[PDB]
Motif scaffolding. Structure first.
Motif, PDB file in Angstrom:
ATOM      1  N   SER C   4       0.927  -1.275   0.082  1.00 46.06           N
ATOM      2  CA  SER C   4      -0.041  -0.030  -0.085  1.00 46.06           C
ATOM      3  C   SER C   4       0.996   1.307   0.031  1.00 46.06           C
ATOM      4  O   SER C   4       2.048   1.182   0.248  1.00 46.06           O
ATOM      5  N   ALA C   6      -0.012   3.989   1.774  1.00 46.59           N
ATOM      6  CA  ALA C   6      -0.343   4.369   3.202  1.00 46.59           C
ATOM      7  C   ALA C   6       0.863   4.821   3.934  1.00 46.59           C
ATOM      8  O   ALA C   6       1.132   5.786   4.573  1.00 46.59           O
ATOM      9  N   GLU C  10       1.027   8.831   4.360  1.00 46.48           N
ATOM     10  CA  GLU C  10       0.716   9.652   5.706  1.00 46.48           C
ATOM     11  C   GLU C  10       1.667  10.407   6.215  1.00 46.48           C
ATOM     12  O   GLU C  10       1.233  11.292   7.013  1.00 46.48           O
TER      13      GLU C  10
ATOM     14  N   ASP D  99     -13.507   0.293   8.287  1.00 42.41           N
ATOM     15  CA  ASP D  99     -12.852   1.028   9.486  1.00 42.41           C
ATOM     16  C   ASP D  99     -11.338   0.869   9.448  1.00 42.41           C
ATOM     17  O   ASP D  99     -10.654   2.045  10.117  1.00 42.41           O
ATOM     18  N   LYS D 100     -10.705  -0.128   9.172  1.00 35.93           N
ATOM     19  CA  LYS D 100      -9.229  -0.024   9.067  1.00 35.93           C
ATOM     20  C   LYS D 100      -8.692   0.243   7.646  1.00 35.93           C
ATOM     21  O   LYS D 100      -7.544   0.373   7.487  1.00 35.93           O
ATOM     22  N   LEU D 101      -9.547   0.973   6.715  1.00 33.66           N
ATOM     23  CA  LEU D 101      -9.073   1.463   5.615  1.00 33.66           C
ATOM     24  C   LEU D 101      -8.458   2.752   5.545  1.00 33.66           C
ATOM     25  O   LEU D 101      -8.530   3.489   6.737  1.00 33.66           O
ATOM     26  N   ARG D 102      -7.194   2.984   4.900  1.00 34.41           N
ATOM     27  CA  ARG D 102      -6.545   4.140   4.775  1.00 34.41           C
ATOM     28  C   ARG D 102      -6.592   4.608   3.305  1.00 34.41           C
ATOM     29  O   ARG D 102      -6.592   3.933   2.492  1.00 34.41           O
ATOM     30  N   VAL D 103      -5.870   5.799   3.663  1.00 33.05           N
ATOM     31  CA  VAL D 103      -5.702   6.644   2.235  1.00 33.05           C
ATOM     32  C   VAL D 103      -4.401   5.854   1.569  1.00 33.05           C
ATOM     33  O   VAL D 103      -3.455   5.686   2.101  1.00 33.05           O
ATOM     34  N   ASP D 105      -4.563   2.788  -0.284  1.00 32.23           N
ATOM     35  CA  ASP D 105      -4.723   1.257  -0.327  1.00 32.23           C
ATOM     36  C   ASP D 105      -5.273   0.931  -1.917  1.00 32.23           C
ATOM     37  O   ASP D 105      -6.040   2.013  -2.353  1.00 32.23           O
ATOM     38  N   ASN D 262     -14.386  13.437  11.649  1.00 40.20           N
ATOM     39  CA  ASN D 262     -14.131  14.365  10.878  1.00 40.20           C
ATOM     40  C   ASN D 262     -15.357  15.423  10.442  1.00 40.20           C
ATOM     41  O   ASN D 262     -14.716  16.642  10.374  1.00 40.20           O
TER      42      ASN D 262
END
Lengths: 91, 300, 300, 300, 91, 91
Positions: C4, C6, C10, D99-103, D105, D262
């Protein structure tokens, strides 16, 4: 000469009459096909002989009429053009 | 150290060249092409642009310019081949078989979008064997999501090893721009046509002597059939190889040479490419049972 | 386990900021920028975004807002620099050498498309050195296939290591949306111009004193020249540093500081960016005989 | 040997199906859906696809066609569930936690674009928690750059392992085609909505009784607050569960169930999804002083 | 003054006269170039003394007509504007 | 009854007057807001009693007037209705 318009919309412009095979098999004989009609788009031709519909064997208008009462998406049409057996469909 | 496509594109980018078409009011279109043979400088392009061409110009990667004379054409498959006069220190690409392709393989599209120059874009193979797009006479397109724009005709679709697996032909654009849908002719069809055009100068097209329509889902369920994809034969033609083998109307064609069938268009594409006079086996279905027959192809 | 972006992204997204411009009939414009100096809060951007600006506002990714004032800008390079008022807990970004960039490298774009927030799209570098797009006075863009839309001007173009390598400037939109073509100003040209803008308050463009046109494969064929990419000298102005160096009409420029140039616009951009008084080396051809000449740039 | 996406899609592709909508003047629709339970054949689609549907048809990738009846729908979240009658040899998909997703992926979007069949496109996750698109009552979309077009509504988003992490709902097309931004409802909201739909047949909205607007950075600066993302409390309805807990006006919502939020739009969507009567933990702040309160949920 | 339009389309809009150089050489002394014509677009002006064409040295109308009979795609004619040697390019 | 239009454009269409709260607190009485005005769109209604302007406490029109003279981008108003408190936010 029962019209095919009242049976299914896709067979508009065709004249049907109960005909017999060269050996006497019961069926439906095509009388005339209107050029440019959806029936003509399927390949209907004059002097043709129907002998069956889909898998069921038919002998008159009533049988395949109550067969199409279920209104399948596509109708298979068993037909003997001359001595060569061909098929006719609809969309 | 970083992962990149640059090492693979170093030895591949010079192979792909552009094409400048001047013909007839004068028309100035452009596309791309791939050099298949470097010794004699044959280039492979799309028949779309060559059709109304009088003089055809080729621009290399380094700016060198040449002249091209068309050897032949294939209107049905939209493939044309040209020759570069006095070729010098040219490079050719290696063609890999597309029969082993799967949905998900990465692909890089190289072409000349909007005339800006040689542009390489990334993407994947969206779906194989897409057909029925009313784009050509014959449909066996490979669909890819890479950005394929105007001027990409005759480009190249490459794997990560630099082997050609497709020729970009048509795009879908609701507003004149790529929306992530691009269609490319497979390389196996292109390679066979190129060899036939080089050796013969024309096309020898085969056929089976069969007329039929595509297989739907309603007919199979109405006939108690376990297969929903195939071909529905409507009529057999006397004197053809199909009649000699003994195929009958109403049959369903399921497999070809052990490889299975996706749609009726695919069977038409493979049978037309195949050389007439060769024997090919067919997987037929008669009244719920499978049968296999061997048929010798005729000549169109 | 699963690869990924991320882990790398980040630590980078907070550096890139957005810019709202209001001015005058009143208009509200939107753009993006990148923070280059945490202590002083310098923000890079694009001139055309700020050309008619009356009030300038900056918001980070977390919602914090500030104010800024224009420092200096040049109309022919389409970049500008801003200073964030009362900086507090700001982060910067690294700058990598865009000269080592090669076609096929991966790159991601960060900006605000259609005024929706901070987004990161992926892509690769289509081709470097693209110019002659009549979009601005100076063209040394690098082309990337990452989706760049309206409002992404002045954003960032990042490699896989998180270092900035370009600033998005212009797009090719036949229908108002991305088609996979996006042009970004290189980092070395933007960074060096930024340092001059903040140190001296205005740029100083060097000039060789040569008026000429580009090279085509036609000219080399007429003159029997092996090189088809370069600059064609058409006139030498008197009193210029080039005139003292010893260059005459008909000269062909092939190499600059030992590096080959693929177009005439590349020479214009590299020379103009370089400050006056620099000593540079030029590889030229004179009736097919290569020679080397040292030239000192003048001042505009 | 080659790194390809094919091995993951082979076991996942037949889980996604298409949907045809016919009815009323006559009109024809098209969409996609995801099978959740293979034993009974529960497929999930978007409500706006079947908002005016008379007959619903579902075809797998092999061509087999079934029919489905609408179990139930939710207007606010734009999610509906369908039941396939006579299920036979169906495949289901796994559900992952969004909920575990991140920018950063990687995501793969499958669907039915422009009626071409089942096509898979690649992309990444641009940003999460996007809202304010005047689309639905509750907006907590996941935005992705994968090129999704018309007919992809109700599709699927798959991680590198093939577990569902989204449901394509809306696109931003200025020219009728994809641009590089696509919005998808997360999987946790979709899964929880699905469980209520098949266990009861109707939804039970959770409500707190607080009337408020968006938090802006200006408000925090006016009140001298360190945080600028949250919910602003403007009124407390008498008789609500919030009044019992002691929450009154002049209040700022900071965190939900111990996790930072957010925007107030995210709070509204999650509260509605949660079952009425359940106790929740609220991160609370008043007059620059943090607080912690526990409140119950009522029925809308 | 032979017509320049008939010689080649790119030279249209100019008047040509076989004059002589300031040092005694033989060259073409341009009489007039119409503003807005392709000749003016290429930078042709008053008192231009063409002394060379591409590679071949030119002295008369016959020889540059001969070389243009091959229809070169781009012309490169070398002149001395005042005392400065410059290259004017045509198509 | 000074008009609220001249205080800020957002307060257009509402008339303000100085009164007192139920418990003697000095405030502002809202007499009439026309339908369709931004003030009406902001939720301002009759019988509203102005008791605060963002943070600063006000008692007459002049105090909130000089508070708003700085022209904040987003303006807050703390109102008391019946026995409860509410807030209004207008740009």
């Amino acid at each position: 000469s029962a019209s095919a318009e009242m049976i299914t919309p896709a067979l508009e412009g065709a004249t049907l009459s109960d005909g017999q095979l060269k050996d006497g098999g019961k069926g439906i004989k095509i009388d005339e096909v209107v050029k440019g009609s959806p029936a003509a788009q399927a390949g209907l031709q004059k002097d043709d002989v129907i002998i069956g519909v889909n898998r069921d064997r038919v002998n008159s208008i009533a049988e395949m009429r109550k067969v199409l009462a279920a209104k399948p998406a596509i109708i298979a049409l068993q037909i003997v053009r001359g001595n060569e057996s061909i098929y006719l469909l609809m969309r």
